């Protein structure tokens, strides 16, 4: 749905994820996934001060 | 075919509520009724091509949503916080002291605002009539005393708040309106302010100034919790389950302390009976109250003075919230919503004696002194506010402590509305309560 | 994909819309009166053939429903038959705005014009009713059928009629009504003119006199008007409560004391002002109107008098003549600065940041001096409390006053800061947001107790004029008074000034008392501190030292020095300062 | 032109020259197309007896002759003649109107003078109390249904701009109708704020009013202000209020009887209007320094007897 | 909030007011000098008003003055009508080559500006 490859911010992704999980997912949960597989997602920070993740 | 309108509490200032047309297909009809809050999934497209193109120059179309599926939610991590505070010491006092942090005193209003936010438990006996759970508050006082600012605070804190004014509203603008529809060619009805506030709160500022025809609609709204209309050949009834908070002014702009409430306002007595809490605020001068009030206000203005950065600002705002209120406000908004949605506290028959005996004692004093006869609706009001007090603690059963505070609020309002000669006699007779 | 130009150096009024400029780029200014709901507009359509399955794309419309004139494939002979595509076609947002000529554009007493402006793309919803918007775009002509039936020979084409009317297509929308932002938009020379108008000692005194310089006396009102036009600071409480920052004023007096002159001054000076009077006004015309909208089957809000006066001053004459049924509609805008509408499905809340400057006359048409201030007025507590200032002025048969009054009113028939210089000051001053000092809070609660004490009735504890709103008014007035100068810290002095103006509801009288408060406190200070004694001459020399800068020349020195001893003798004459035998002066009981 | 009106067509650089409510002189061509008579406006204008005037200018009985000439059918009333004549002369507007009220018993020459005034002044309007309304003197402003512009449908105080409006039974004017006079009489504007319309007009004119005494006849036992049904704010605006009293003295009744009876058996108006039209066009007096002091002292003395509002000083 | 009790300069305060008197006129002259420069530099942002969307000589000074005030009315530094006259008249003095002024009925008409290198002249003052 995005015409550009810039990933959306985490503060949008987590609410969308939380509804699907039937359980609230927070920032610290993402770091658990990164520990298991380092190359799972790109974790570059947005200049707005919002965390981002991408394929 | 259905229209969807923005959330009442989220419209930005200066704009009318944005809305879209929605297309519903077979097996998805009658899924919702006017006043419902729903979430729908569908396709967003333009479909007014055809006759509009040649109808006029620079022709235009409209956007619609083809409703594929419509739906009408908490997590345990949040309940980890709600349950903790629910059993803390003085939970009721933390709630009341957090209502309108920058307003001094008026604690009998703040407790009335708090109870009206949480509300009671509606009941519908099959084959009999229903019972409302909404708490009705009337704020009558002299100019000043921030009666209007309270309704502005209720607007932001409550979930679904609809704000109205006595003179700025109309009979059509409250009950319903009529629109044409070319698709089916029969008249369609669009709801007013009372229909919007269904399962919400309806605020009527300056309640006295509206005409009796406008005021008659409000009375039947609180009594029946529904809107009945027969206009343009449409006869139907809509759900209007809303709580009312009203601010008014006495005759001549000053309250006559030597006359009853029933003789200080043009609001007729049958309409006064629809309220649960009747607050009568006086503004009488005294250096004791004036130094306290002024030093609160002069600090309120120096506080609200304008002047990971977002996190820093939220932390600083939280610090100021703590400095004036015991509970952070956005947490309280969540806290109230969870209590309203989840908790439905129930009565214990063990407290039947505590309720009936006080009522008979209150009735006995009514004929003894005073002109206002105690009515069953007062007892109905006591149970409702008793349920609301239990709903504050997130306890599924009514306790004796909640009933004591419930008795205190209703008796105090009834006593304070009496004339001065009768007022002093009743205060001594109900020193226990 | 759209392009939007802006920042045109010239702005053309509605009366400058002429057919000689069709197709050119121009910028106009006009107060918005109506807005319509946005709709998508077909920008570039596509079609598929009927005889064959050919497809035609990139069909630009250009203000008319243009179907393709030919099938592009030579194997097909189709013409004037097409199927409109709703998927490969593109749509664009489109909105119609009705704007109106400003008051300052047209000569006084003339009618204002009207015009319809078209918005596309992101520019939609940027126009709000009551806003003084400015548009940038080009002039176009649209098909029109209203021109038929008019006199004159009508052109024809061959037969087809080709009447037209002019409309404006705006590609850009801006709404126009912090110190560092403001200072960055001005050059050095604008600063120097503005800097020198602030960096002077008597600036507050001069600006009071500059209000309506042709009107004699009434220094009380000339202070009031200056403060109302400066306004206060709007504040929002953390719990979600909005604090009003605008000042309301009312003036009542003799039918010959000039009060309609003040209102005519303000509406002729205030950047956004509306004049209305008594019975000629109505409820709908003041706040906002619910009226059927064009282009659709729904309603819309049409701006009232107050909405046009947003961020300005609304002036009402003959306020006591206004019916109660329409005085009510002013209430909500005076305190909450918002308008609540619930009628015909237009449920909304509108900004009403307006300062009301009303004028009225006593109940009997004359100030019956046999009665109190209550018997002279028909206004009640709900409306009286909302005025931060409430002046009642009187005229009486003083001989010297009438000679001065007659002298000035005749010089008009025979014939310190210019009105332009004030608008270059208030715009800068309005950017300051003063803060209360800690001791000012202590001093404010002192004075509020004092005002509440005086307003207290003799038997009942209920007050009538001073309420909690007035406590805010003291800060609100003190803000504006401080806002007139280069300080963001409210001093105790500015609290006293607001205290005086709210409570008030040979040698010149002002000079006499000003000398009194200076000398009297001087003696009480040294007595309470036990300093050494001083003589009358030393008192005179001390006072002249305090006002060194007010002396224009040493010739004025002797006059003021001579004037000083008369003040002393008056105090001794009525034993205000007791002589002790050269003599020493001590406060009398 | 008259209450008839016909449509006009304007082209080219003659736009931006006319607005609603203006007075125009038109030179144009009369046309007709099917019937629709209209004017192709070709131009738009928006703005020997001299010795004979001097011969009357320097005469000694000038004031008496002019005063007498206005009402040859009315006896004496010298002061009434002068002020109403001074009403026609008017003040001097600068970068001016004088209003008069006649109070007297309901049998003395009140109606006849007002009839003369509107039949001797250009485009005067004759009005009465119950014969008019609030939108009678005030032009009915409305908005066009197809062009959406603001239009005005004229009014008594708008028709007589620059002229004289005659109001009979000025006491019996409705309170709402009486209320709108204040702005008209002092500011010469009519501001209207209604649904969708916010604008102000100009109605610069002179008002001549006649009022019957309270009750049946003037009673000297009550004060002067109690025999007049006007509140002081309205009563202060009038430049001149004439108390016309009916005596029973034959030393003046018989002379009046002769003047009336000599008129039903079997300067001129053209000179008078020529005189008036010349003065209003060419004479622009300026108050001298010496005359300044007299105005000051007269008002001070009048004020010192304590209703001497400053509206009487400009009068 | 108060001032000196007894300054050493007591009789010399007469010289103090004399010294104020000696330069009272100079301060007013600088007020005059500064205010014209406020108009002398503002004219730079004024010849862009005429150059942009004005197209003929028949434009009179009354119509231009009302246009200038309305263009700067919305800005942070608005300008009055009588100030615009000294602005419009100021242009012709510094631009005697492209604008000429002649009078009819006692009013002024503005000849059609041939705007060329408008910016260079303002620096020669
Ligand atoms: N009891 C109070 N404590 C603190 N501030 C108050 C109180 N009453 C009024 N105010 C001040 O007055 C304003 C409220 O006035 P308003 O809403 O007009 O009262 P009402 O509408 O009831 O007459 C608020 O801005 C508030 O700061
Ligand atoms: N201080 C003054 N200086 C100059 N003129 C004055 C002064 N006071 C009154 N006037 C004159 O008196 C008139 C007052 O009219 P006004 O009181 O406004 O009428 P209303 O009471 O109907 O509004 C004005 O036209 C003005 O010219
Ligand atoms: N001083 C006078 N000179 C001439 N005619 C007079 C005089 N006084 C009374 N009349 C006559 O008395 C009649 C009164 O009529 P008029 O003045 O028109 O109305 P009203 O009866 O209301 O005063 C007139 O017809 C007039 O001829
Ligand atoms: Zn084909």
């Amino acid at each position: 749905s995005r015409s550009t490859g810039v990933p959306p911010e985490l503060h949008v992704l987590l609410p969308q994820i939380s509804s699907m999980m039937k359980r609230k997912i927070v920032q610290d949960d993402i770091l658990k996934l990164l520990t298991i597989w380092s190359d799972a997602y790109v974790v570059e920070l947005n200049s707005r001060g919002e965390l981002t993740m991408n394929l | 075919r259905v229209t969807l309108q923005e959330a009442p509490g989220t419209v930005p200032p200066g704009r009318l509520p944005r809305h879209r047309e929605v297309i519903l297909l077979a097996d998805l009809v009658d899924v919702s009724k006017p006043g419902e809050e729903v979430e729908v999934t569908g396709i967003y497209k333009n479909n007014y091509d055809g006759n509009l193109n040649a109808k006029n120059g620079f022709p235009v179309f409209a956007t619609i949503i083809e409703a594929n599926s419509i739906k009408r939610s908490w997590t345990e991590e949040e309940e980890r916080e709600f349950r903790k505070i629910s059993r803390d010491r003085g939970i009721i006092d933390k709630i009341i002291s957090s209502m309108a942090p920058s307003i001094y005193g008026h604690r009998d209003i703040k407790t009335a605002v708090a109870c009206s936010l949480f509300g009671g438990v509606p009941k519908n006996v099959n084959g009999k009539h229903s019972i409302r759970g909404d708490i009705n508050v009337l704020l009558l006082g002299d100019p000043g005393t921030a009666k209007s600012q309270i309704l502005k605070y209720v607007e932001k804190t409550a979930h679904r708040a609809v704000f109205a004014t006595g003179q700025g509203a109309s009979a059509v603008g409250l009950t319903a309106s009529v629109r044409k529809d070319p698709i089916t060619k029969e008249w369609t009805l669009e709801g007013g302010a009372l229909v919007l506030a269904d399962k919400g709160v309806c605020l009527i500022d300056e309640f006295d100034k509206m005409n009796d025809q406008d005021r008659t609609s409000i009375h039947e709204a609180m009594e029946q919790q529904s809107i009945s209309i027969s206009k343009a050949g449409i006869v139907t009834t809509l759900q209007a389950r809303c709580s009312i908070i009203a601010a008014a002014n006495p005759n001549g702009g000053r309250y006559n302390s030597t006359l009853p409430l029933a003789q200080n306002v043009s609001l007729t007595e049958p309409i006064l009976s629809a309220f649960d809490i009747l607050c009568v605020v006086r503004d009488l001068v005294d250096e004791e109250a004036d130094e306290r009030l002024a030093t609160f206000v002069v600090d309120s203005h120096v506080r609200s003075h304008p002047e990971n950065a977002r996190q820093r600002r939220l932390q600083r705002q939280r610090k100021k919230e703590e400095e004036i209120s015991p509970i952070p406000q956005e947490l309280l908004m969540k806290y109230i919503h969870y209590a309203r949605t989840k908790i439905y506290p129930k009565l214990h028959q063990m407290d039947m004696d505590k309720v009936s005996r006080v009522y008979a004692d209150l009735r006995r004093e009514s004929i003894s002194t005073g002109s206002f006869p105690i009515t069953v609706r007062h007892l109905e009001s006591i149970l409702r506010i008793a349920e609301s007090f239990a709903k504050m603690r997130l306890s599924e059963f009514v306790s004796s402590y909640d009933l004591d505070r419930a008795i205190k609020v209703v008796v105090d309002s009834f006593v304070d509305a009496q004339k001065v000669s009768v007022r002093r006699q009743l205060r001594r007779s109900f020193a226990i309560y | 994909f759209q392009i939007s130009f802006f920042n045109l150096p010239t702005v053309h009024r509605i009366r400058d819309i002429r057919s000689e400029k069709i197709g050119s780029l121009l910028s106009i200014s006009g107060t918005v009166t109506r807005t319509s709901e946005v709709r998508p507009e077909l920008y570039k359509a596509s079609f598929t053939c009927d005889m064959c399955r050919a497809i035609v794309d990139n069909v630009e419309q250009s203000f008319k429903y243009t179907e393709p004139t030919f099938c592009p494939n030579p194997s097909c002979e189709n013409r004037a038959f097409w199927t409109l595509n709703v998927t490969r076609s593109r749509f664009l947002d489109w909105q119609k705005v009705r704007i109106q000529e400003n008051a300052n554009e047209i000569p006084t007493g003339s009618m204002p014009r009207t015009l319809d402006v078209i918005l596309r793309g992101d520019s939609v919803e940027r126009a709000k009713p009551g806003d003084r918007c400015k548009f940038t775009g080009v002039e176009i002509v649209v098909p029109d059928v209203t021109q038929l039936g008019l006199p004159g020979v009508k052109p024809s084409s061959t037969v087809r009629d080709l009447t037209y009317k002019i409309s404006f297509l705006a590609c850009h929308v801006i709404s126009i009504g912090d110190q560092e932002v403001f200072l960055n938009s001005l050059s050095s020379d604008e600063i120097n003119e503005l800097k020198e108008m602030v960096k002077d000692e008597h600036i507050y005194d001069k600006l009071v006199r500059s209000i309506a310089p042709a009107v004699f006396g009434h220094e009380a009102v000339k202070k009031g008007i200056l403060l109302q036009m400066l306004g206060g600071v709007h504040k929002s409480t953390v719990e979600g409560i909005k604090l009003r920052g605008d000042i309301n004023i009312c003036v009542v007096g003799d039918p010959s004391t000039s009060k309609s002159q003040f209102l005519k001054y303000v509406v002729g000076f205030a950047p956004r002002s509306v004049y209305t009077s008594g019975k000629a006004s109505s409820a709908a015309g003041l706040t906002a109107a619910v009226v059927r909208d064009e282009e659709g089957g729904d309603y819309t809000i049409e701006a009232g008098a107050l909405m046009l006066a947003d961020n300005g001053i609304c002036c009402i004459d003959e306020f006591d003549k206004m019916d109660i049924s329409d005085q009510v509609a002013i209430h909500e805008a005076m305190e909450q600065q918002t308008i609540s509408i619930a009628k015909a499905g237009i449920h909304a809340t509108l900004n009403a940041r307006t300062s009301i400057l009303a004028a009225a006359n006593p109940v009997g048409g004359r100030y019956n001096r046999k009665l109190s201030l209550r018997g002279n007025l028909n206004m009640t507590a709900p409306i009286m409390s909302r005025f931060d200032l409430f002046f009642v002025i009187l005229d009486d048969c003083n001989e010297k006053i009438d000679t001065e009054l007659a002298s000035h009113i005749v010089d008009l028939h025979m014939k310190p800061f210019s009105a332009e210089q004030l608008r270059r000051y208030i715009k800068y001053a309005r950017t300051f947001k003063p803060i209360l000092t800690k001791e000012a809070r202590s001093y404010l609660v002192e004075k509020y107790k004092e005002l509440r004490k005086d307003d207290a009735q003799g038997f009942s504890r209920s007050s009538y004029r001073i309420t909690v709103r007035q406590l805010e008014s003291m800060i609100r007035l003190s803000e504006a008074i401080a806002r007139a100068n280069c300080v963001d810290e409210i001093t105790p002095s500015f609290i006293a000034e607001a205290y005086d103006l709210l409570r008030q509801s040979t040698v010149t009288y002002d000079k006499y008392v000003s000398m009194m408060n200076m000398i009297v406190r001087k003696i009480a200070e040294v007595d309470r501190e036990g300093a050494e004694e001083l003589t009358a001459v030393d008192i005179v020399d001390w006072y002249l030292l305090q006002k060194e800068n007010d002396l224009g020349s040493l010739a004025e020195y002797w006059e003021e020095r001579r004037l000083a001893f008369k003040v002393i003798k008056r105090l001794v004459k009525d034993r205000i300062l007791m002589e002790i035998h050269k003599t020493v002066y001590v406060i009398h009981p | 032109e008259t209450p008839h009106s016909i449509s006009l067509c304007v082209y080219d650089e003659l736009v931006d020259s006319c607005r609603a409510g203006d007075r125009i002189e038109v030179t144009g061509t009369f046309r007709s197309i099917p019937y629709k008579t209209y004017v192709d406006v070709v131009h738009v204008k928006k703005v020997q007896d001299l010795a004979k005037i001097r011969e009357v200018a320097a005469r000694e009985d000038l004031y008496s002759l002019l005063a007498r000439s206005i009402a040859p059918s009315i006896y004496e009333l010298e002061d009434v003649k002068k002020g109403i004549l001074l009403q026609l002369f008017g003040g001097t507007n600068k970068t001016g109107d004088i209003n008069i009220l006649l109070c007297g018993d309901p049998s003395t020459s009140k109606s006849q003078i007002l009839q003369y005034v509107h039949k001797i002044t250009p485009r005067g309007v004759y009005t009465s109390g119950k014969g008019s309304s609030a939108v009678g003197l005030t032009a009915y402003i409305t908005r066009d249904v197809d062009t959406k512009q603001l239009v005005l449908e004229s009014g008594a105080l708008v028709l007589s701009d620059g002229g004289v409006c005659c109001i009979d039974e000025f006491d019996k004017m409705s309170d709402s109708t009486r209320s709108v006079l204040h702005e008209v009489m002092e500011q010469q504007t009519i501001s209207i704020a209604k649904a969708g319309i916010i604008t102000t007009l100009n109605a610069r004119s002179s008002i001549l009013a006649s009022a019957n005494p309270i009750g049946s006849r003037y009673n000297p036992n009550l004060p002067v202000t109690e025999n007049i049904d006007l509140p002081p704010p309205l009563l202060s605006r009038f430049d001149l209020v004439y108390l016309v009293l009916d005596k029973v003295d034959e030393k003046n009744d018989r002379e009046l009887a002769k003047h009336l009876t000599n008129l039903y058996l079997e300067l001129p108006v053209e000179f008078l209007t020529m005189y008036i039209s010349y003065a209003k066009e060419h004479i622009h007096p300026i108050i001298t320094e010496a005359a300044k002091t007299e105005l000051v002292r007269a008002y001070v003395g009048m004020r010192k007897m304590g209703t001497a509002t400053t509206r009487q000083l400009e009068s | 909030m108060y001032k000196e009790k007894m300054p050493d300069s007591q009789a010399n305060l007469m010289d103090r007011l004399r010294e104020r008197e000696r330069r009272s006129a100079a301060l007013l002259s600088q007020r005059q000098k500064r205010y014209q420069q406020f108009l002398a530099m503002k004219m730079t942002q004024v010849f862009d008003i005429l150059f942009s969307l004005t197209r003929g000589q028949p434009y009179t000074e009354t119509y231009l003055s009302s246009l200038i005030v309305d263009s700067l009315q919305d800005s942070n530094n608005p300008i009055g009508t009588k100030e615009a006259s000294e602005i419009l008249a100021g242009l012709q003095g510094i631009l005697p080559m492209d604008i000429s002024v002649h009078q009819v009925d006692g009013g002024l008409k503005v000849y059609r500006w041939n705007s060329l290198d408008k910016n260079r002249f303002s620096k020669l003052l």
Side-chain angles (χ1 to χ4, degrees), chain C residues 22 72 185 216 378 426 436 451 475 490 515 549 582:
Chain C
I22 297 158
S185 78
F216 183 65
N378 203 42
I426 285 183
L436 289 155
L451 290 184
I475 314 183
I490 300 177
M515 290 221 49
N549 295 349
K582 292 177 178 178

Side-chain angles (χ1 to χ4, degrees), chain C residues 9 11 13 15-16 20 25 132 134 185 190 196 420-421 424 525 546 548-549 551 553, chain E residues 2-3 20-21 31 34 41-42 52-53 55 59 63 66-67 71 73-74 76-77 82-83:
Chain C
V11 183
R13 295 140 298 192
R15 62 176 156 110
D16 300 316
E20 75 196 335
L25 182 92
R132 202 177 85 106
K134 176 168 65 178
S185 78
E190 292 185 2
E196 294 290 81
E420 300 81 4
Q421 292 164 344
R424 292 197 288 269
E525 182 177 293
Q546 301 324 283
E548 174 180 340
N549 295 349
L551 309 183
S553 170
Chain E
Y2 297 126
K3 301 181 183 175
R20 178 176 288 145
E21 178 174 296
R31 174 62 169 196
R34 283 173 173 163
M41 78 80 64
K42 177 167 291 298
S52 302
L53 205 77
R55 49 191 283 179
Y59 286 65
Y63 179 91
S66 175
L67 185 66
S71 301
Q73 179 276 345
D74 69 39
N76 295 123
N77 193 98
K82 70 183 66 59
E83 305 187 307

Side-chain angles (χ1 to χ4, degrees), chain C residues 134-147:
Chain C
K134 176 168 65 178
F135 305 78
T136 298
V138 296
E139 188 176 313
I140 73 169
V141 289
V142 304
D144 175 40
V145 298
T146 64
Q147 187 190 346

Side-chain angles (χ1 to χ4, degrees), chain A residues 22-24 50, chain B residues 75 77-78 310:
Chain A
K22 305 93 187 165
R23 186 173 184 167
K24 184 169 64 78
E50 298 294 333
Chain B
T75 199
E77 297 74 14
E78 295 280 61
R310 298 179 68 209

Side-chain angles (χ1 to χ4, degrees), chain C residues 198-259:
Chain C
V198 186
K199 212 65 54 175
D200 176 32
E201 302 197 345
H202 312 84
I203 50 156
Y204 186 27
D205 302 342
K206 292 180 175 181
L207 292 170
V208 183
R209 298 203 300 268
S210 175
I211 301 301
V215 178
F216 183 65
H218 307 82
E219 301 300 305
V221 185
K222 293 183 189 166
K223 277 175 183 274
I225 283 168
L226 181 70
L227 304 186
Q228 179 170 43
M229 204 173 293
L230 284 176
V233 186
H234 193 93
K235 310 175 188 74
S236 183
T237 301
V238 195
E239 75 218 51
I241 281 315
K242 295 186 295 182
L243 299 176
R244 171 171 61 90
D246 298 328
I247 291 157
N248 303 314
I249 302 190
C250 181
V251 187
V252 174
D254 175 294
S256 66
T257 47
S258 61
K259 74 191 85 76

Side-chain angles (χ1 to χ4, degrees), chain C residues 6-13 25-29 134-138 168, chain E residues 53 70:
Chain C
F6 188 65
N7 191 19
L8 296 196
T10 176
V11 183
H12 286 60
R13 295 140 298 192
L25 182 92
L26 67 155
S27 178
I28 73 183
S29 177
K134 176 168 65 178
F135 305 78
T136 298
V138 296
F168 186 56
Chain E
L53 205 77
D70 190 69

Side-chain angles (χ1 to χ4, degrees), chain B residues 226-242:
Chain B
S226 68
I227 301 303
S228 301
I229 187 167
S230 180
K231 280 174 58 264
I234 306 179
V235 177
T236 195
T237 307
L238 295 185
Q239 304 301 318
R241 299 158 293 196
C242 61

